[PDB]
Design an enzyme around this catalytic site. Sequence first.
Site, PDB file in Angstrom:
ATOM      1  CG  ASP A  30      39.980 -35.663  30.519  1.00  0.00           C
ATOM      2  OD1 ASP A  30      39.981 -36.860  30.936  1.00  0.00           O
ATOM      3  OD2 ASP A  30      39.783 -35.337  29.339  1.00  0.00           O
ATOM      4  CD  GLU A  82      46.912 -38.620  25.034  1.00  0.00           C
ATOM      5  OE1 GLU A  82      46.496 -39.110  23.986  1.00  0.00           O
ATOM      6  OE2 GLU A  82      46.136 -38.102  25.827  1.00  0.00           O
ATOM      7  NE  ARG A 135      45.579 -36.728  20.653  1.00  0.00           N
ATOM      8  CZ  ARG A 135      44.564 -36.838  21.522  1.00  0.00           C
ATOM      9  NH1 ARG A 135      44.560 -37.821  22.423  1.00  0.00           N
ATOM     10  NH2 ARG A 135      43.564 -35.969  21.484  1.00  0.00           N
ATOM     11  NE  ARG A 145      39.241 -41.213  21.673  1.00  0.00           N
ATOM     12  CZ  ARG A 145      39.366 -40.339  22.694  1.00  0.00           C
ATOM     13  NH1 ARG A 145      38.679 -40.539  23.815  1.00  0.00           N
ATOM     14  NH2 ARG A 145      40.222 -39.309  22.621  1.00  0.00           N
ATOM     15  CE1 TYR A 203      43.004 -40.990  24.710  1.00  0.00           C
ATOM     16  CE2 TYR A 203      44.388 -41.055  26.656  1.00  0.00           C
ATOM     17  CZ  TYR A 203      43.706 -40.336  25.707  1.00  0.00           C
ATOM     18  OH  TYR A 203      43.707 -38.936  25.768  1.00  0.00           O
TER      19      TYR A 203
END
EC number: 3.2.1.18
Lengths: 388, 388, 388, 388
Positions: free
Chosen positions: A70, A197, A212, A290, A324
């Site tokens: 990341d 976020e 979140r 997800r 996301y």
Amino acid sequence: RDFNNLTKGLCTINSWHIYGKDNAVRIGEDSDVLVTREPYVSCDPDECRFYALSQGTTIRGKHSNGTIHDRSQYRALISWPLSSPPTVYNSRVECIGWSSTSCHDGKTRMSICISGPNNNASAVIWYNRRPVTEINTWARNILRTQESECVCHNGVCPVVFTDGSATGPAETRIYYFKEGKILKWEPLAGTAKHIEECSCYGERAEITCTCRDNWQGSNRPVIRIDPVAMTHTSQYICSPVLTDNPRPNDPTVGKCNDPYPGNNNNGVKGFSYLDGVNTWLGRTISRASRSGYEMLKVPNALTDDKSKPTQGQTIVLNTDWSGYSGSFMDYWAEGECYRACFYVELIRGRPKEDKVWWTSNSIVSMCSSTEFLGQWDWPDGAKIEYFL
Amino acid sequence: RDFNNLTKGLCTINSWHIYGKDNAVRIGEDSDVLVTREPYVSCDPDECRFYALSQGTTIRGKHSNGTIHDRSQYRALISWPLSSPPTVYNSRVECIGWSSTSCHDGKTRMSICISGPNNNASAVIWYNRRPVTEINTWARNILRTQESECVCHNGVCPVVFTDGSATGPAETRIYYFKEGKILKWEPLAGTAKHIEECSCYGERAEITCTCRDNWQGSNRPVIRIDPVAMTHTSQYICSPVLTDNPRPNDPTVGKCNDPYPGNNNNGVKGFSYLDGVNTWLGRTISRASRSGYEMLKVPNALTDDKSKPTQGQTIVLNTDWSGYSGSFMDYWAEGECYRACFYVELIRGRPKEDKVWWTSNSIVSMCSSTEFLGQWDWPDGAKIEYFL
Amino acid sequence: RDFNNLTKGLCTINSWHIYGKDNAVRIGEDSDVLVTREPYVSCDPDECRFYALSQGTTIRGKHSNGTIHDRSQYRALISWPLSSPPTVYNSRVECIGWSSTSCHDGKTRMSICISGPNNNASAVIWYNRRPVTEINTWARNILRTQESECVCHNGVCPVVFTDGSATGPAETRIYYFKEGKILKWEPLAGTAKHIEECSCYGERAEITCTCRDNWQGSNRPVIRIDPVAMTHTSQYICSPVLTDNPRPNDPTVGKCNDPYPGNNNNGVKGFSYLDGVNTWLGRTISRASRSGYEMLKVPNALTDDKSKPTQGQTIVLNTDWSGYSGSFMDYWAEGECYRACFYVELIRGRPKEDKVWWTSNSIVSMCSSTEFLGQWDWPDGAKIEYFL
Amino acid sequence: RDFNNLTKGLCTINSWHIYGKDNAVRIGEDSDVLVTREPYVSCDPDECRFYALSQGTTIRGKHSNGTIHDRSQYRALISWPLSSPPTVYNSRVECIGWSSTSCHDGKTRMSICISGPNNNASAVIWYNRRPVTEINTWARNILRTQESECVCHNGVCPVVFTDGSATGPAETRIYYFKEGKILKWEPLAGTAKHIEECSCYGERAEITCTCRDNWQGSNRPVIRIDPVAMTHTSQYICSPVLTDNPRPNDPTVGKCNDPYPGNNNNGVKGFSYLDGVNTWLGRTISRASRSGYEMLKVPNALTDDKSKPTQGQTIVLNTDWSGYSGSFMDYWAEGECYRACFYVELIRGRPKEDKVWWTSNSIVSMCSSTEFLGQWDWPDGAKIEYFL
Ligand SMILES: *[C@@H]1O[C@H](CO)[C@@H](O[C@@H]2O[C@H](CO)[C@@H](O[C@@H]3O[C@H](CO[C@H]4O[C@H](CO)[C@@H](O)[C@H](O)[C@@H]4O)[C@@H](O)[C@H](O[C@H]4O[C@H](CO)[C@@H](O)[C@H](O)[C@@H]4O[C@H]4O[C@H](CO)[C@@H](O)[C@H](O)[C@@H]4O[C@H]4O[C@H](CO)[C@@H](O)[C@H](O)[C@@H]4O)[C@@H]3O)[C@H](O)[C@H]2NC(C)=O)[C@H](O)[C@H]1NC(C)=O
Ligand SMILES: *[C@@H]1O[C@H](CO)[C@@H](O[C@@H]2O[C@H](CO)[C@@H](O[C@@H]3O[C@H](CO[C@H]4O[C@H](CO)[C@@H](O)[C@H](O)[C@@H]4O)[C@@H](O)[C@H](O[C@H]4O[C@H](CO)[C@@H](O)[C@H](O)[C@@H]4O[C@H]4O[C@H](CO)[C@@H](O)[C@H](O)[C@@H]4O[C@H]4O[C@H](CO)[C@@H](O)[C@H](O)[C@@H]4O)[C@@H]3O)[C@H](O)[C@H]2NC(C)=O)[C@H](O)[C@H]1NC(C)=O
Ligand SMILES: *[C@@H]1O[C@H](CO)[C@@H](O[C@@H]2O[C@H](CO)[C@@H](O[C@@H]3O[C@H](CO[C@H]4O[C@H](CO)[C@@H](O)[C@H](O)[C@@H]4O)[C@@H](O)[C@H](O[C@H]4O[C@H](CO)[C@@H](O)[C@H](O)[C@@H]4O[C@H]4O[C@H](CO)[C@@H](O)[C@H](O)[C@@H]4O[C@H]4O[C@H](CO)[C@@H](O)[C@H](O)[C@@H]4O)[C@@H]3O)[C@H](O)[C@H]2NC(C)=O)[C@H](O)[C@H]1NC(C)=O
Ligand SMILES: *[C@@H]1O[C@H](CO)[C@@H](O[C@@H]2O[C@H](CO)[C@@H](O[C@@H]3O[C@H](CO[C@H]4O[C@H](CO)[C@@H](O)[C@H](O)[C@@H]4O)[C@@H](O)[C@H](O[C@H]4O[C@H](CO)[C@@H](O)[C@H](O)[C@@H]4O[C@H]4O[C@H](CO)[C@@H](O)[C@H](O)[C@@H]4O[C@H]4O[C@H](CO)[C@@H](O)[C@H](O)[C@@H]4O)[C@@H]3O)[C@H](O)[C@H]2NC(C)=O)[C@H](O)[C@H]1NC(C)=O
Ligand SMILES: *[C@@H]1O[C@H](CO)[C@@H](O)[C@H](O)[C@H]1NC(C)=O
Ligand SMILES: *[C@@H]1O[C@H](CO)[C@@H](O)[C@H](O)[C@H]1NC(C)=O
Ligand SMILES: *[C@@H]1O[C@H](CO)[C@@H](O)[C@H](O)[C@H]1NC(C)=O
Ligand SMILES: *[C@@H]1O[C@H](CO)[C@@H](O)[C@H](O)[C@H]1NC(C)=O
Ligand SMILES: *[C@@H]1O[C@H](CO)[C@@H](O)[C@H](O)[C@H]1NC(C)=O
Ligand SMILES: *[C@@H]1O[C@H](CO)[C@@H](O)[C@H](O)[C@H]1NC(C)=O
Ligand SMILES: *[C@@H]1O[C@H](CO)[C@@H](O)[C@H](O)[C@H]1NC(C)=O
Ligand SMILES: *[C@@H]1O[C@H](CO)[C@@H](O)[C@H](O)[C@H]1NC(C)=O
Ligand SMILES: [Ca+2]
Ligand SMILES: [Ca+2]
Ligand SMILES: [Ca+2]
Ligand SMILES: [Ca+2]
């Protein structure tokens, strides 16, 4: 040429229609498309644009092996034309960094990018394509921000930042900027336990973010900001329809000022449009992964702790990957009210499709309609096997 | 639309923040990116742009074999958008030539390119995208100039040019131009013995260049120019913190008007911001190779011949390659003072990475902050082995 | 926004300097560069651009096999930015056709393209990006025009067209256009026997074209046009310095009103700036092949039939290929006089380099200087062997 | 900046000249060109542009296997510069969807795209780059529209839409929009039995569309629309020169208000300019396949049921493929009358060239001339065998 002011209320959302889809990973199999993640959309007075954090390689290039990580020095915030793919030749670099947020104030744009090691990171605030302000880490453990657009009212644009543990108490602050300069900052207040976020929108001079909790809730925290008084509050969404991921089964009763327990230390960026009866919550269909994406109308979700859905619309089916999602509106559209919009990241590659060595995504966005339109599902559409 | 005037003084540099990085060689492994070297940055009233001398091939193309050579008919000065790579499709050609300099005067841009054989080379001065003036070689042995931006004050933009031996006495002149036409020129004066590649900046109506003595000093020469009177002087930086490369160990005492001996006939382009206590010197970490890069604050370096560092910041670590560095500022930014900025060339390929047949680079730039921001190191980031 | 008028006289040409070079075939070995031929340069009030007839393939693409052929439905007139290569992504299509000419009139641009079979071809005249006028073939055997820019004075832009045999008498006409509409046309007059490909320039309200007699002269024909009276005359250049190709040795005496015999039925497009003592003639160095290129100052070449060179400059050496050359000037440059400029096509591939199956080219252009600058030679620079 | 009004009548069409050709599939063999179909052309006040429905892959990319299918979530309406190919890097996305139409109203552009499953599809109407109106399916079986440009008069732009069976009676409506909002809609009236894909033009304040009866006629239906009164009528073209495909032999007498029988359930999009004696009909040369293309002048075709051709022009020969064709004019060209123009889709790949796995196309367009110009044929020009 004069600052925008949040004058209108939201129109009524009776269904959602396609706004943009770029089919990025499909075209990336044979084009010079950049590897990204953490996408979002933001509008100017005259155009709306797609945004993401680049990884500094193309999909088919060799340095794509490893882009699951990341943070690195090769990432940057870039933007490109609506519904085109993030191409090497068609992208504009906003600032260099591995966490970001951006909004237009009616006069010009503010973009914020963060770079650094984990323990010595900094933000530098660009206003009108130039650096104006810089902020160093206060708790020394990955200074991060929204990864979606911010919102302004008559010059003042509030941004939420967290610094510290993702797995315990952290230190969160709301900074109020005007033309790139800090006017004031405050630490988090109210009952939300952990912030990460935030996805925000604004209407009738107030700003609502849905964030979140990474520490312990499967229900989401809400920060409400007043941009004239420069103050805020936090709560959790009352409704038992749980929208983080992973998450336990939805209960019969929910929690307004405490985390809902069940999963600890993990989550996803999401959003909701909270407007009395006109309230819609977005979430993954899979409770464990997800995957899939749906929109659910849950009247008064924020306050009524026993509220169940009344209408729904499937955006991505459970067999395809999502990721996301965030909120934006085009505050400069003609009309009596703001049309609510959102995007969903469609992640492809590692961790789940570990048969390739890269992680990238495409985008789908949607805006609302007062009509009741029929639905279609909008998957990424690449076949991983062509990349082998 | 009226000429820019150097009105302000420099802000105080308490640390440096990232400005741009293009990750050029990484993306060049699978994109149509041009082979370059001698990079630099220059700003217009409305945008800042990256610049370099092209080699007329892409990295992955076959005519990249051989691009270690410095002068040829296939090189040109090109520019492209900030933090994008020099792509075939996104680059703008300024002029044709293998040595260059460029600056904007508040009304329009002057670019200068030199081409020729070693013994019969010429400069042609372009103002507002057209040729206006040409200058033929005066000493007949590689007529060269700054390879970084020049600076203007109320119309007059001074440029330094050297013609002659790189290994002995040479003939250096400062030309003063206004709208592309020569107003006056002078030969070098003061105590500097040899001039090559000056990096310049301006503040409160005076211009300071830090050049490279290729003949014999490991300390750097400084030319101070008055653009209203059109005159100059040279000296060497007094400080014992030596910043050419290669170089001997730093001594206890330095030299203000003589070369510091130790290495002869070799060097690198560098820069410094000389402002009393607010003085920072940039240099390679390796004393023997162009590797690593650091910024060191050495109060009064120019005058105090016994000055040692007081604060520092590492830009590139010693295990990664660097190269040429230069100075620029955005004279059209809002604010009370000029923010000091710089770039470092990150060379990849021959001579040191001789396992490929090409020589190319990427760029990193940095501007200053009044804050004390934490640091990160900014390496090129390609893996040469992917090009095999 | 008002029509341009040829007010000035030519500056004095004491030497030539580089203007643009695009290195097209080099970069085409690994980029999406179009296959072209018949190149030229033309300026607008605000920018100068490179031009060519496309072949509708890239160099490395498979349909490049066969592009030696001159006429087809896949060719078009395209333009791209100065000193960039004709790329698929950066080119602008002006009109469709396999013969052309274009000029800007101070208000907007006229481009003319011809397409058709050999016996039923037509021209359609575009003014301000739209079709306005069309002309059908009058002698029914390859209607052709200049293949370089035309020139305008207060609205009227004259164009020469030939229709008929390339190997005998043909029918040539000068059309006078104003805003795309025909004002008048005349058939050829004076002593020139055959006209093909005129290269033109204008100064002090008169236009001079230097054309190619394909039938029988090795000396070149000159058409002088008066744009106010709309009339013309033709003659041949008197000088014994012969500039077509192929050609016999230069004689001691030349011919003013008759072809110089020696080669029949073949030639090349060329040009000259005819200005009393300030007269320079361009030509191939090879008397037998289109190879090498030189500029020669031959005072009064047009009238003095015994004039020999006085000064010269080598543009391309005899070991490298050249091709078509033409004249342009930037009539909108600041200054007291027009600076004379030219381009040379550098052909690569068939017929001479028959080891590949394609024919393409790059460009070099040059403008004049009042200085005496040293020279360099400017070859294409690709290695054909990389394309195998 | 004020709405356009259909003031002029059509000029007289004595022949046709080339307008644009993009050679898309040729250049797509070695460039990043998008796979398309259903092309068309539309003009703005300042430029004319090529349009198509993308398939979301490049020709040479692997996800091109399968693009014979007509509806999917990866298609979008894109536009690019006149006579350039639909490239990944040079295309602009208008809206997302697999059926479309677009026109400029003198102030800004309206584009309409339809997406959905077959039984739950919707249209969303974009005006000035934003969504304004949405329409859901009324008969629940593939809601479709023109696939070519619409036409406006003083603000009101009429669009025809069909929803229902392609093989029986369907439900067709004409919607009248002004600035993106619905003013009125009506169901089909008059004698036409089935409507599909109308090609329209306008002159002297009336709009004429020539559509496709998919159910049973081989002669074409005509809808005439009055944009001030907002009403219409339909009829079939009387002439025995039949222009759908497939079709029976042309008869001696035709039908004005009934389908001509012979082929059922199949067809192609086509057009005609219906102007008394000045009437020209376009059609495929093959009566059985979409191959070849010709223009035929048939005086009074609409009313005279025994009218035979008087003049013709071949656009594409019978040995090369064609496809869909449509009508456009540049309503903002200088002049006394509108110049009639058209385009023809040149389909390559499946079903007929089943030796590849993809279906794509290029474009040719033509406008009229008052001259009698000679003709050339304009085939796609790729060789399928290079793609193997
Ligand atoms: C044409 O297009 C139109 C327009 O799109 C189509 O019409 C739409 O069709 C949709 C699908 O049916 C429909 O969406 C559903 O709406 C339900 C609400 O309707 C209820 O009310 C009406 C009227 O008031 C009643 O008549 C009706 O009986 C309903 O009860 C929602 O309930 C649906 O969402 C739930 O189902 C989906 C999957 O089926 C779940 O994924 C979703 O999460 C919801 O269910 C879970 O969550 C609730 C809340 O906690 C639980 O109670 C429930 O048991 C489920 O819980 C499990 O699952 C979740 C997630 O996996 C997990 O976290 C939890 O722990 C449990 O495991 C759904 O939203 C639209 O409303 C409808 N639109 C309109 C305008 O009519 C039409 O079909 C198309 N086709 C054609 C041919 O015309
Ligand atoms: C978070 O971020 C912050 C901000 O970046 C980090 O804090 C920074 O940390 C830096 C690294 O320590 C630090 O930089 C150093 O500063 C020194 C100056 O400080 C001195 O003064 C303070 C207060 O006045 C004293 O307390 C302290 O004791 C110090 O003495 C510089 O001296 C350092 O530079 C020298 O070291 C580096 C490598 O370590 C060399 O490469 C460099 O060239 C300098 O040393 C050579 O040169 C000098 C001068 O001639 C010689 O005397 C010396 O012996 C060396 O000579 C050899 O090497 C050179 C080059 O190789 C060769 O040419 C020569 O011949 C010899 O061989 C260094 O600049 C920052 O100042 C500090 N910033 C701030 C605001 O605090 C923090 O660490 C980060 N991390 C965390 C977790 O928070
Ligand atoms: C630094 O840069 C400077 C600037 O560039 C350089 O200086 C330049 O150097 C050039 C090369 O010498 C020079 O160019 C030549 O100029 C000659 C004219 O000068 C004459 O006059 C001076 C003063 O008036 C005298 O002192 C001197 O003696 C000279 O006589 C031209 O004559 C030259 O052109 C001819 O030679 C070339 C090749 O050498 C041929 O290709 C060309 O075609 C010319 O010769 C042919 O044509 C003529 C005319 O018909 C015939 O008479 C002759 O015999 C040749 O004929 C054959 O060849 C042709 C073509 O192949 C064929 O068609 C025919 O049938 C025959 O077979 C040449 O132009 C510049 O003038 C000079 N510039 C300046 C400002 O000084 C300097 O060298 C550089 N280097 C350094 C280190 O400083
Ligand atoms: C230079 O350029 C110029 C300009 O282009 C060239 O001149 C043009 O040449 C064209 C080709 O000859 C010509 O086009 C033809 O025009 C005919 C009309 O002319 C008639 O009138 C004149 C004067 O009034 C008379 O002198 C003359 O005798 C003619 O009778 C059309 O009839 C032609 O179209 C028909 O033929 C083509 C192929 O040849 C068919 O494809 C087309 O469909 C037409 O024929 C079919 O349809 C009709 C109508 O139903 C039937 O009656 C007929 O039998 C055919 O039917 C079968 O075929 C169709 C389709 O396949 C099928 O559906 C049906 O069932 C049947 O099977 C043609 O249009 C131009 O008019 C002419 N232009 C000018 C300005 O002069 C010149 O040649 C070039 N070359 C040189 C070197 O100069
Ligand atoms: C927003 O409100 C401020 C203060 O009331 C006003 O000056 C500004 O002009 C308003 N913005 C716009 C776009 O009208
Ligand atoms: C990616 O990198 C790993 C080690 O980091 C290596 O083993 C692997 O084979 C690489 N994958 C590819 C496709 O190169
Ligand atoms: C710079 O100074 C000159 C002379 O004082 C003045 O004319 C000019 O306008 C000044 N520049 C600007 C941008 O104000
Ligand atoms: C580069 O050129 C040299 C000779 O100049 C040749 O031997 C070498 O093999 C070439 N390298 C490559 C990779 O082609
Ligand atoms: C050119 O001359 C005409 C007629 O004398 C005049 O109207 C026009 O303005 C002149 N052009 C320019 C640019 O001055
Ligand atoms: C080019 O075409 C010819 C025949 O036209 C064929 O024989 C030749 O091999 C082709 N060349 C290449 C490299 O494909
Ligand atoms: C079109 O007609 C309307 C109504 O007559 C008028 O207002 C408008 O200005 C006209 N359009 C133009 C471009 O003149
Ligand atoms: C295309 O897909 C089919 C099955 O859908 C497969 O059999 C075929 O081989 C594919 N074609 C190519 C060239 O990949
Ligand atoms: Ca959580
Ligand atoms: Ca040195
Ligand atoms: Ca000849
Ligand atoms: Ca039919």
